[PDB]
Symmetry: C2
Subunit: 298 residues, 2 copies
């Protein structure tokens, strides 16, 4: 608090002078190797430098596909134990990985994973490395591949849940109308009958929901998914289908071994609406009845 403030200012010139002085030495190496890496290492203690958007130098390189750079930068980080800088988030709370995925640069995505980079870190919207992949203006399971293949902290992703009422990765695929990924996840370990926190729905529920007749079949068949699973509001896929008026879908579900016996809520003593109830499509009504009385029925 007194003229002892000097010790503070002088101390800075100590550990710092070495910095500026280290560069000077590294700059001499670059003059005998033309190796931009060495010249980049000299400023190692700077790769953490943010910007107007809070993007580290490595953050920008991934943004402008400067693959050449990302190569070097990562080298410096890896060979310096500073394997933490590769996680610094920008103002949007995005990590280098996050971007490599958002930009679709699968090549880089793999590279980052090799050295640190926790794919568990969510973004401003609460989406992890995987979650982001499962999305795309057009779609691309190619990303999900890089992740799944190699990466110790990668196996947990296929069990997380996004901000939006926590829709596990398996749920996302269905919402992404992409069975390609659906298999990718489940195959490499993934709870098929996962129950999300919103309405306790499952893959089949969202499938029948958006009437993804394709996914629905693919799920109940190959994926050996549980056909009769009730949601939080007590509803099986055979319900949503009938309600929405999805003939072929209802038919497919029925054949899949869908028990017509089910009651969501009132129209022990506690019965309620059944599949054969909520239906505004003449076609749907028919099958529901015919398939009920005929073949196995009191």
């Amino acid at each position: 608090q007194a003229p002892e403030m000097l010790q503070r200012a002088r101390e800075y010139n100590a550990r710092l002078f070495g910095l500026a002085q280290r560069s000077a030495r590294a700059l001499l190496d670059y003059g005998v190797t033309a190796d931009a890496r060495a010249l980049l290492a000299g400023q190692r203690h700077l790769l953490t430098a943010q910007d107007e958007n809070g993007d580290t130098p490595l953050h920008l390189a991934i943004i402008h596909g400067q693959t050449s750079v990302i190569e070097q930068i990562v080298y410096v980080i890896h060979h310096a134990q500073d394997l933490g800088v590769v996680n610094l988030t920008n103002h949007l709370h995005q990590t280098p990985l996050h971007l490599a995925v958002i930009t679709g640069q699968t090549s880089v995505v793999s590279f980052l994973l090799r050295v640190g980079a926790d794919p568990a870190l969510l973004d401003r919207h609460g989406d992890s490395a995987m979650h982001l992949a499962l999305r795309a203006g057009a779609g691309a399971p190619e990303l999900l591949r890089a992740l799944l293949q190699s990466g110790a902290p990668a196996v947990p992703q296929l069990l997380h849940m996004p901000d939006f009422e926590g829709l596990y990765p398996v749920h996302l695929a269905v919402r992404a109308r992409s069975p390609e990924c659906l298999d990718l996840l489940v195959d490499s370990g993934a709870e098929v009958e996962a129950t999300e926190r919103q309405g306790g729905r499952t893959a089949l529920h969202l499938a029948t929901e958006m009437e993804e007749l394709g996914l629905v079949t693919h799920l109940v068949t190959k994926l050996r998914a549980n056909v009769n699973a009730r949601t939080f509001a007590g509803n099986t896929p055979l319900h949503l289908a009938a309600g929405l008026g999805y003939p072929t879908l209802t038919r497919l579900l029925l054949k899949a071994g869908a028990d017509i016996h089910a009651e969501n809520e009132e129209p022990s003593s506690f019965r309620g609406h059944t599949p054969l109830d909520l239906t505004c499509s003449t076609k749907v009504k028919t099958l529901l009845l015919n398939a009920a009385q005929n073949t196995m029925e009191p």
Copy 2:
């Protein structure tokens, strides 16, 4: 002298912090351009960094033919008015130019000249850019060309004088047994009858000296060099030739219009040794006499 030393330490952190902070910004540019130049500019205030041998980063690049680097480095220097760093000498008192020449990298030699780099600066031995060129384990006039062509501070070189008794560039060429350069110099302006500070000798003197019959002829003929020129010790080429015992050379000189009339020093009243005197070769003696009495003689 009192706890006011603080202002000193704190001040350093002022103008310097911007440095380390500038790099940080330049390092962000490199992450969006992969341009090593920008990353090199960020450390501009370091290109002056010496080393164990006192070699600047640009000094090393020229040493290890890192042409790629030299390209960038010079750009930074040029576009920063720091056109003085390109003159910093190493421990051997050598400038970037000096090396570009010593290493024979003609390409670089030209490049340096374009931006500053005073070819007038001598080295540990007192040799300028030109002086060095006029030398080589095998020889190379290709260097002298780069210099002569383009370069405002280049025209003065062809009038300087090396440490060794100041032997002007024209003298060097003769000592380099290279008429190629001899012409190169004279053609682009160069005193032919230049008299060095040692023995006041001239091109012809050194020519006849090392008996460069080739140069001798080339000099007295095309170069229209003065045939009868006495040194400090009062001696014309016709002297040295006779003394050494160079028949054809003496003959060539004679025909060149070499006046037999000449006296160095005693064997108004003040006569001394003449060409026809100092001679241990029977052959030489003959011509000297025959050519004297015969054709024009009292």
